Design a protein around this ligand. Sequence first.
Ligand SMILES: Nc1ncnc2c1ncn2[C@@H]1O[C@H](COP(=O)(O)OP(=O)(O)OP(=O)(O)O)[C@@H](O)[C@H]1O
Ligand SMILES: Nc1ncnc2c1ncn2[C@@H]1O[C@H](COP(=O)(O)OP(=O)(O)OP(=O)(O)O)[C@@H](O)[C@H]1O
Ligand SMILES: Nc1ncnc2c1ncn2[C@@H]1O[C@H](COP(=O)(O)OP(=O)(O)OP(=O)(O)O)[C@@H](O)[C@H]1O
Ligand SMILES: C/C1=C/C(=O)O[C@@H]2C[C@@H](CC[C@H](C)/C=C\CC1)O[C@@](O)([C@@H]1CSC(=O)N1)C2
Ligand SMILES: C/C1=C/C(=O)O[C@@H]2C[C@@H](CC[C@H](C)/C=C\CC1)O[C@@](O)([C@@H]1CSC(=O)N1)C2
Ligand SMILES: [Mg+2]
Ligand SMILES: [Mg+2]
Ligand SMILES: [Mg+2]
Lengths: 343, 335, 352, 121
Amino acid sequence: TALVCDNGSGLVKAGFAGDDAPRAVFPSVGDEAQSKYPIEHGIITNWDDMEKIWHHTFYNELRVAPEEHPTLLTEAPLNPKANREKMTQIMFETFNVPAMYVAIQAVLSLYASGRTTGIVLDSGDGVTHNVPIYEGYALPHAIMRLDLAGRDLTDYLMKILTERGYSFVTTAEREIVRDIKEKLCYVALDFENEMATAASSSSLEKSYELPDGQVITIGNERFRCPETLFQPSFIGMESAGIHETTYNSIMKCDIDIRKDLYANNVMSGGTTMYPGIADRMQKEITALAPSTMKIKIIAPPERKYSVWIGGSILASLSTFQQMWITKQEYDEAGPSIVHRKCF
Amino acid sequence: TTALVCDNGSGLVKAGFAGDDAPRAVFPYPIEHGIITNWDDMEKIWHHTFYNELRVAPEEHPTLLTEAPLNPKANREKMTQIMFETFNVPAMYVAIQAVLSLYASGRTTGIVLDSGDGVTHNVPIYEGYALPHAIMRLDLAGRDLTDYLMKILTERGYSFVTTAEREIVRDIKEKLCYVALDFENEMATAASSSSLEKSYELPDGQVITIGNERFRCPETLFQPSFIGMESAGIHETTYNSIMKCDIDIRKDLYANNVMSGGTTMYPGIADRMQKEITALAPSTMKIKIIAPPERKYSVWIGGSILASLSTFQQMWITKQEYDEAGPSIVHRKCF
Amino acid sequence: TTALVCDNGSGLVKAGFAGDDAPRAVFPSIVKDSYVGDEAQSKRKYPIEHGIITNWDDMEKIWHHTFYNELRVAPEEHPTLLTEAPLNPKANREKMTQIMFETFNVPAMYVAIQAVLSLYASGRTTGIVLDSGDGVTHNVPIYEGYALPHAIMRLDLAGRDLTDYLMKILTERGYSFVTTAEREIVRDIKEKLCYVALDFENEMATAASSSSLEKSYELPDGQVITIGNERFRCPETLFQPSFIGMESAGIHETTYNSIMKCDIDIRKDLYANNVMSGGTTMYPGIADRMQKEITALAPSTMKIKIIAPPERKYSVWIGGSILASLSTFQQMWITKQEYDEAGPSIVHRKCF
Amino acid sequence: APGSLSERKNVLQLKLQQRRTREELVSQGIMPPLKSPAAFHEQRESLERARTEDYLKRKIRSRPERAELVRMHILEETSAEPSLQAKQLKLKRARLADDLNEKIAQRPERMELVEKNILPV
Ligand SMILES: Nc1ncnc2c1ncn2[C@@H]1O[C@H](COP(=O)(O)OP(=O)(O)OP(=O)(O)O)[C@@H](O)[C@H]1O
Ligand SMILES: Nc1ncnc2c1ncn2[C@@H]1O[C@H](COP(=O)(O)OP(=O)(O)OP(=O)(O)O)[C@@H](O)[C@H]1O
Ligand SMILES: Nc1ncnc2c1ncn2[C@@H]1O[C@H](COP(=O)(O)OP(=O)(O)OP(=O)(O)O)[C@@H](O)[C@H]1O
Ligand SMILES: C/C1=C/C(=O)O[C@@H]2C[C@@H](CC[C@H](C)/C=C\CC1)O[C@@](O)([C@@H]1CSC(=O)N1)C2
Ligand SMILES: C/C1=C/C(=O)O[C@@H]2C[C@@H](CC[C@H](C)/C=C\CC1)O[C@@](O)([C@@H]1CSC(=O)N1)C2
Ligand SMILES: [Mg+2]
Ligand SMILES: [Mg+2]
Ligand SMILES: [Mg+2]
């Protein structure tokens, strides 16, 4: 059947079109390597490395005949035409895929939401974007990038567990801290107030058992780490908080569609899984926007894979089973064809 | 003044007391396929259990009952109704068999394969919560296996058809059958040499002899086609069940595959299940199959264990609670 | 080249040859430097009381006397099958092995569980044995030739004790037996006249009601004594250990518990295959009684069968013989070579 | 009939090959495990029991709420009833893909947008 590969900053989610949720998810070869990053920031920088990643996906993870299945790939908002054309080239010449197609992650995330118009917040591992999309079209001039993503968050959590006396720095230790992040962290509704209450006691501090049995205990770090998303300054950045960047992104769009955008604010990507990030984003976006504005934040419980799922759903829709780029089309028009077919 | 554990099986009631490490009573259809269909009949079964098997004052002991995966809310409510109004039990509680089996394993997260008499399920469970959308049913169970063994002993010339004869064949199944590691190969070896055939003495002294039937009967579990079913083999169904679960707990599941129910007692079923599940799963996946010796009664034991916890005392459904909220209460209390 | 079967009892060695229908030699298990067995009884310590070999020097002398004086054979020339008690400690078996091989250079040897042998002689591999000898009584559930340790029951009330209590109750009749010789007299009385009653209370009632119950017994010195309800009271001890001051349960109860301590699946099989062995099970009626009791304790829809081979006074040994005689069995002795190459440890792998 | 010493020998030899391996018998919960201690299967059992009881009694207090599982995408959200779920979800995915189909099908050409004052030439 058709394949769907989401070539994430630090995880590849590859599966079979149709069914919900991918089959394989592995570090962006991969794990077995972990037992021994060519897409940091979201853009494919090393093509040899990447090619090896695709080989590992095709043959080791999904165990399939690349020549036998059409392949849908994901690309980052604002992927350079040259880049897409390279992906296409490699898929067709290095894998003789029957056909293929390239899609914008944010857009897929939106589709999976069951929409064609709205503003996506896609916060993965190495990069975070705001992508306003209208009738299935991403508005480039309004897209926002923000190199503050999930890894950075993990790091800062390390760097603040330090004030607690704990010293994580091994790659292994880093991973430990990552798990801690995922399990215990959470965005606070009111940050200053949450700090006040922090000192004020009761159920804030959690325990957490390291691999070697030793139990460490974590306090306000829980909500400070993810707070970085709203105050990049916490890790030294003059950038505006994800909410501000969202606002600006909306504003950088024609004024008619703005209502639509504020009422269809869909979140995707791992880094949006923090409990409360929704309500918070609501608070902030609400406070920046016109007082008579319908504001809705959409946070599907499975956003950790929004994109990829969309990828599936999309490639299922009878319509789309016409946009695919056939090997023949490619032979007759070269890589350039992508720009005409995928958009 | 203690609790009673009652596992209402498709084929066999397992009843007893909280604490003991095995059901005191086990006895033999108003619950074919695992769901209570006839309530009068069932009520008589419960009466017989309470009064004839366990010889107890139903009004004097709290009662934990088992129910099948995906028991309809109406059903549980009915069980509750009958326990409280037809038996004035001090309190009671209803539990999901598969889940009990898992608890007895000493876990709260994993995927159970519960293959009893009239039905076989796959139940992925997480921290006590069975994930309904991923549960798998499979009406191919133990009875069916007995039958097919009869229907293949036929090719050997033997003709079992009496109910009594059926029972004989069942015993033969239990004593001699066994899942083969490689089926095609095991057939090849079957012909190659003897050493595979075994000897079985009927009640009336006459000795019959059994060959590849031994491993063909249970092979039905992996190829339902053997008895005419378009269903997938228990291993395949397991795989599918896992895959229908959130992608994150997948790993926990492949790593925590616990088997329960009589029909899982066949020697080698473990290693085989390992082979197959391994072959279907991602090549870098920890795969573990748990097959407790005590699994012909996994469920019930779990039940016991649970009904025995001091903690659990807080979650019984008291007669008072029932009076104040009706049968519906069950849905809020047992989950 | 013919094997020897030796059942080392708490009270009585039973030794002989594979094949033979009952043991050639049977002598007391006690010990100009050292007198063994009957000679010992003549002029003027039991190293296996309770069933477990406690004194190895003594025991070694017992084996020597068996090999050379009773069976008159070349220990180096015959494989030897020995019996051991249920739950004999691995160290113990290993010791027996060691001594057989190094102190007797036996060509080969093997160790077997008495109760199990008794069961085999019955012609079974699955059932629950009640082995009640001289110094100890066990319940051993065995399944497909395997004894289930966790369900085994011991009960230090055995035959000796019974003899004693018969003495201690013949006292109420005025008779005073206390000499070792007198003890032996009372033992013979026990064996000849005692018997388990079907209903004990009722049997007492009937005891008073009429005569016809009392019997007459002539002492060695011509004098005739007369014995009454003592006859059935002595053995009643087996069912009420309290009679001689024990908080233990009666053999029947212990049997029941032993069954129950087993897989529910196999219980039916245990109940319908209840085989009795050992001297102390020879009391007339013990079977029918055991039936009564076991029946009363068990589920009302349970097939219950008590097997009491009239020869059980040697169940074990016979089994031993039978087994040591199978062509099959020849492949699983423990050769001297095997022993040299693996030490006493080998026993645990070969005998079980 | 009597159990003659020779016949007694045949039943035996025939039943001693009819016999499973004890490995296979603890494998089926008839045998206790070889390797444990013969006396003290009872206590041993008790003890492993405890171990388990402790685990359960703890893992129980910490037991999450259905809601929390749904937060995490463990259990589907949220109604209706266990049995329907399986199917209901398939209905959901289906109906959505469909509602998406025309939506993308009737997707304005670029110039619609541009003239609609969105995006440059
Ligand atoms: N429950 C969680 N809470 C917070 N962060 C999480 C959680 N689970 C995963 N993450 C983080 O999400 C990040 C990865 O998500 P994601 O898969 O979207 O990254 P990526 O796909 O590789 O990059 P991209 O989304 O840009 O393609 C990881 O850094 C991970 O630590
Ligand atoms: N040793 C064995 N090998 C194979 N099958 C066996 C064995 N022992 C029992 N069975 C079969 O297991 C089946 C019953 O097991 P089980 O008690 O789990 O059924 P049930 O409890 O009545 O139904 P359910 O498990 O769904 O509640 C019987 O059909 C029986 O034949
Ligand atoms: N006819 C009989 N009635 C009752 N008891 C008897 C009878 N004959 C012998 N006994 C008793 O049986 C006891 C011995 O039997 P047995 O030979 O089984 O003891 P043992 O073999 O030395 O010990 P073990 O059986 O434990 O190996 C003796 O105490 C003896 O008095
Ligand atoms: C469990 C898991 C999560 C993940 O997303 O991990 C991916 C991939 C991973 C690669 C190295 C790691 C040792 C291998 C596997 C971890 C994969 O790098 C990440 O963990 C980086 C490092 S810290 C962080 O938060 N992201 C992202
Ligand atoms: C004929 C006989 C029977 C017996 O079983 O006896 C054996 C062995 C005997 C040893 C001492 C005795 C003087 C020697 C031989 C008696 C052997 O002790 C016993 O009688 C003991 C003492 S009371 C009793 O009943 N058992 C057991
Ligand atoms: Mg992504
Ligand atoms: Mg069951
Ligand atoms: Mg003996």
